[PDB]
Point group: D2
Chain length 447, copies 4
């Protein structure tokens, strides 16, 4: 019934695992010869047959068909077509339950290396641009209200730091994914005394699963991957929100390149930050995959259950999504143009009310009291229709006699950001230190 | 308006952070003296005042009130009540934006140590019981259908292995949580050249945040904790499903102790596995917290936003949930009674059809062909109204002449499980190895 | 910027909306000529080409390519290849923002109609089977422990009742999806005084959208469908759990047919309930889609934002999933075979302990004490090897002097079940009434 | 096993259901006497005590303690302390499985009624304000880029329209919650021929549950409420996003009142839109609750399972959250002040580029080419320092000979807006019509 089969994994999804499945079968065939189930004469026929399939796949031949239950079944059918009955010995002691997780892990191993590379390039793009644009200052925000002046590079580095934690989380997930489950059989293990150390070595896993029942029932590797990817997308969704708002004509801080923007087929004046919006939307898309698999696993009994097959489509979609989003984000950041003129112009006096308060603190006034006075000063300006940096010393002294002609030094945005030299701050020396820390972090991640 | 204030964090939630907030303020006051904002005379008054509050909290005095915005505000108000205006200097350069994440991290640091301890006791309980009940064999399942015989200890260890990965994930989350954000100010950093190394040391964090904007905008530590906790609960929900099914009169494999079960106020014969059901239900509860915070963070602009305050209730609920569930799970596993008689009795012949097939494989028949023959044998039994272990050699030979009197050795459940000696399998030697690996793993985790 | 396009929807997803897009464009064309933007002659040409594209689509021809942003641009580009510059007039006053919601809504109208047909068929299957096997009695469970005897038919009907509510919810969502958004333009509306009542009538919508900004910025209709589908699958995940457990050899109440079961390429004795498992798993799958659109929508500012383009794939996936799951469930319920023998055998005496306490309540003893007495009767039985069923009158007398020889009448399962005549109970008459109410309820839901 | 009880619901949550539990017990008592389980005299006593417990509850007295499993057991235990063993008769044929769904439903009936009142008040606030400021025009956005001019009132109404659908959905959910489950017993129903029509009538439900197994095993009514609430909060998260951005100094369109704003204890110049942010954040909070119950329900077998007890805290949290969020939003919309000046100033010429292309379409030029011409006009303007608004006729002539001096008429924002008269558009007459439709729609929703 084409219907019930419509509910199982699709053709394109199964095809994506075709090569790793063949790689897994080659390792298994070799261990079977060592275990005495295959003679060297038979092993050779099987390897040659499997290489035959590997060759066809590289030629774009699609092996799996709607007739085949899955790639495992498709490759076994194809082998039998190429070499006859000997192909059936390869099935000895092997379960789809271990092949499915082995193939998925091999695929993830390969996919994460590629994702990792693109993520580091994204981080690097942010870091290198922060180095170059280090002298630029614009408003920093809390509640989307102007808070205090900060360096544009501090802003870029904020996102690089968050992405760097994501890179670290990816690495940790990779270690647990890098554990080989082949040899777990259907749930009880392998009964031929197969050499799992041999399979681990040939398939390049770091170690082998400890318990056969767990190895076949769990999808922790999937959840964990989806979770890390979701938090990564959350970071990108916040950075996209930032750039989309900064791209408004109202803010005017920057403009994306033509490559990462599109116009409107109706409104001739439009230039839209499509790339950013797309990236933001993927957070929901990836989160849905995490929610999906968590629910699929919840309350299922041991050990293997057919429900588990929902992992394949979720993993592949997220891999592809991530791989694309990352390059697009890299493209967006490296090619956007900032307006230093508008960023500078956005720097307004009120943002220095905190500095104005600290000024009084330096002269002995408790911050609580100084906070009040500074607000009173902002109020006084707001009342006479002027900026606080315009109030005369006299208007200031009427708030507090502690104000002196030196107060003028407060109304300077460079002086403002430069007071934040303590590690992590927006001062130039702190931004420089960050750039160095991230370069070393990225070096370590790459190692 | 009591209404808009109803939407902010509650009293009991703010109170849970009262002591770490005081601990954070003490560290800050000291750095402020070093930074020249406080004289030794003032620092002493402030520390004494804060100790005063620490004393009151230990006496069960609730400091925060609906009048107070949050614990930070409540403690600052209380300090002012105890020592006067000098209390206001403590606010110098400090933002609620850094205090909120600092206090939450301190709380999580403390909560994870306690959760970790209980999780290891749960793992240990599973491992120690597996050692003792190592000779017990029962049916292993896939699709909730009898698959192959496995050791009850293999089953217990399956869950211990999964919990052990959770323990490892907890450790990784703990390292990123153990990074101190105090000194990030509102978003630009601290402007007094505060000694962050000094704060890190006194508050016991492993390091300090790299970027002030990120330190105040991110809640990765929260998401990550909620995510790891969710996967942990998923594991427990599957183990609960297992035990609930095994607790049915139909399976009859085991019975929970009176302590972890309840009766019915209407049906006098009932004995319900309440504990298990409760644990299973917490997976949804904890998942909801993860979904909650992910959505709260999605698309928010830099840096701090009031939305972020939803993290506190979610973290606390999950901590408390986890802390309780773990002890209950430990209680359930250590006190339940298995029926070795019913487990043994559940071992039926059909489960050895795979072994029956392998038997033919050993005699030269390809598994594919042997699989068919074994099924034919099961079919032959099913047709004459008997068990395959009852078929006479003659009925067997009619399926395949390769069957010999030695086939009798196939119908033995101990022989069945003992063939799975390859690492990870259900054989006794493999189960023993697992017990040792987990004891070393638990030793490492505890270190 | 190819990869940027890798973030777009797939060619297959857009192809899925090809026919409704042509249909929507055909209506706008006629409304355009009426608005005087198109001569009666320019219309005939445009309309002529649209029918052509339609013929290509029906022949499997795929017009959308990797170069086309979406299906809308594909059709415009294709129509231009067919009639030249004149095809460009179709664009007057039209925006993709209104076309995507128009197209997706048309698609959901056609898909929901098909889903309803199958849903109602599933309910009927449960109802009819319930009528036939109405005499079968088996254990009822709470906490998966034997509670009180119920009729297999009560069981089948509880699921039919839940699914009937799903069907009711599906129709309510149908009404809101059936509002035309065409004419909202990019956000401000249409500046040609286009006749929306005409568009509505031709595209067969029940009414038109009240506000243009809302119409192209909202995806409530998507969220609702996904919510209703999710809850529907939750019901199915529960029914699947039930049948999967009842399918175990341990329970032995029923066995699925070979058509909805599958074997194991390793273990020759296996006969697995794949159909049920696949159904249960789609609950997570559909929930995942609901979760993504909710997140996509959250915190987005007005009006249209590119983020919204994620609705299509989620809606299509859930449509095909639900359509297939419903038919599979129908086949499962229809062809499964129950074991009246095992179901009857499962009826154990302790399940009548409540009735036993009630027996004492009728004799005057307070429920609390009666409950306690029944409790002791079952404990006295077990510790004695036998079941409360075989306990001698003396043994019962030992627990309470109220126990007379007429207590024997409590140990009858039909009687137990026949005790529940109050509406909704498991007594035969009540089950029969349910069957009639659901027959009527399905009748009422079809007539709309 | 204390900690086991730490997994139970909280004392506060159970206390929240105290009054409805007493109310439900009062109905069952009368139905019991009628069923002959209680003498007319035993009833008067039982009923007498129940009213007493009710008086304690109204005096803030907390009856549920840490020792009590839930509120139901608390009330029974309390009633027993008041009248002795006789209170035990109330238990006949009753199960906690039916009491929890009965109690929670009663609670939701009372809570939903209050939520509706506030929701409709929020919509009216948006509607009335829309009527008053109907002449205000400002930028309309897509991708957060200036699109086409719209009326501030069109904007306010788009949100009112979305919220009106939420209100419609809330009432549909109300109907399904309004079905009485009392009388389903533990799962099999009631064995005393209890009068359900009597219970229904007294507890004020619209009808009774059709199947006892379904009634105590389902939580659809919970899932629905949470779904509707979630979508409702999504609308609010979007409106909040809008107003938060419009509140920036960069946009300067409006400013919230001091009552819905808050300062910074560090930065003395801050004035933050806390109310809006708090509202946006509750979208995640409520969604989280929907997600948990869906997961709680998923794959659970029939009928009752202890897992279901998680519904209470989720339902209560969402009720209080929604009730407060709605009033806060009403105050926000009501007291915010807009800057007609800044909104008018924001109107920039390029936003009329569509109208400019349309101007050429009226003169015969094909939309595609007209679009291109308009595009060049705006690029020609920018690269020239001025806006398409100031371009000389010659400059326009340079782009297309079709540009005459009457093109000047395109550069008027009222005209731009007044172009959208087709239903749902931003023209004044259309906005006025919307105001009337919503007034009627709110009227129709109250009358039920």
């Amino acid at each position: 019934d084409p219907i019930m089969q419509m509910l199982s994994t699709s053709i394109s999804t199964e095809q994506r695992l075709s090569e790793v499945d063949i790689q897994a079968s080659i390792a298994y065939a070799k261990a079977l010869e060592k275990a005495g189930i295959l003679t060297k004469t038979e092993l050779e026929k099987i390897l040659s047959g499997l290489e035959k399939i590997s060759e066809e796949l590289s030629k774009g031949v699609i092996v799996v068909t709607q007739s085949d239950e899955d790639i495992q079944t498709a490759n076994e059918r194809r082998l039998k077509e190429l070499i006859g009955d000997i192909a059936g010995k390869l099935h000895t002691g092997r379960s789809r339950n271990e092949q499915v997780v082995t193939d998925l892990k091999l695929f993830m191993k390969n996919s994460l290396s590629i994702i990792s590379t693109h993520l580091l390039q994204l981080i690097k793009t942010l870091v290198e641009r922060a180095a170059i644009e280090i002298d630029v200052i614009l408003p920093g925000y809390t509640h989307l209200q102007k808070a205090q002046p900060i360096r544009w590079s501090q802003f870029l580095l904020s996102h690089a730091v968050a992405l760097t934690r994501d890179s670290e989380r990816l690495g940790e997930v990779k270690k647990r994914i890098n554990v080989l489950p082949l040899g777990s059989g259907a749930l009880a293990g392998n009964p031929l005394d197969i050499d799992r150390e041999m399979l681990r070595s040939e398939l390049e896993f770091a170690s082998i699963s400890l318990n056969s029942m767990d190895a076949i029932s769990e999808r922790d590797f999937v959840v964990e991957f989806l979770s890390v990817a979701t938090l990564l997308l959350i970071h990108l969704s916040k950075m996209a929100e930032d750039l989309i708002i900064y791209s408004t004509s109202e803010f005017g801080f920057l403009t994306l390149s033509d490559a990462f923007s599109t116009g409107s087929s109706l409104m001739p004046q439009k230039k839209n930050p499509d790339s950013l919006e797309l990236i933001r939307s993927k957070s929901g898309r990836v989160f849905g995959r995490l929610a999906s698999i968590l629910m699929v696993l919840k309350g299922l009994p041991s050990t293997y259950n057919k429900d588990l097959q929902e992992d394949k489509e979720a993993v592949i979609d997220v891999v592809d999504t991530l791989t694309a989003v990352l390059q697009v984000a890299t493209g967006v950041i490296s090619t956007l143009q900032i307006s230093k003129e508008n960023m500078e112009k956005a720097l307004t006096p009120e943002m220095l009310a905190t500095d104005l308060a600290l000024y009084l603190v330096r002269k002995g006034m408790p911050f609580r009291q100084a906070h009040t006075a500074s607000g009173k000063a902002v109020h006084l300006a707001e009342t006479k229709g002027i900026a606080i940096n315009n109030l005369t010393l006299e208007d200031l002294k009427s708030i507090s006699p502690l104000f002196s002609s030196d107060v003028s030094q407060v109304f300077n945005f460079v002086n403002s950001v430069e007071q934040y030299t303590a590690l992590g701050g927006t001062a130039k020396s702190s931004v420089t230190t960050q750039i160095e820390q991230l370069r070393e972090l990225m070096k370590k991640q790459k190692e």
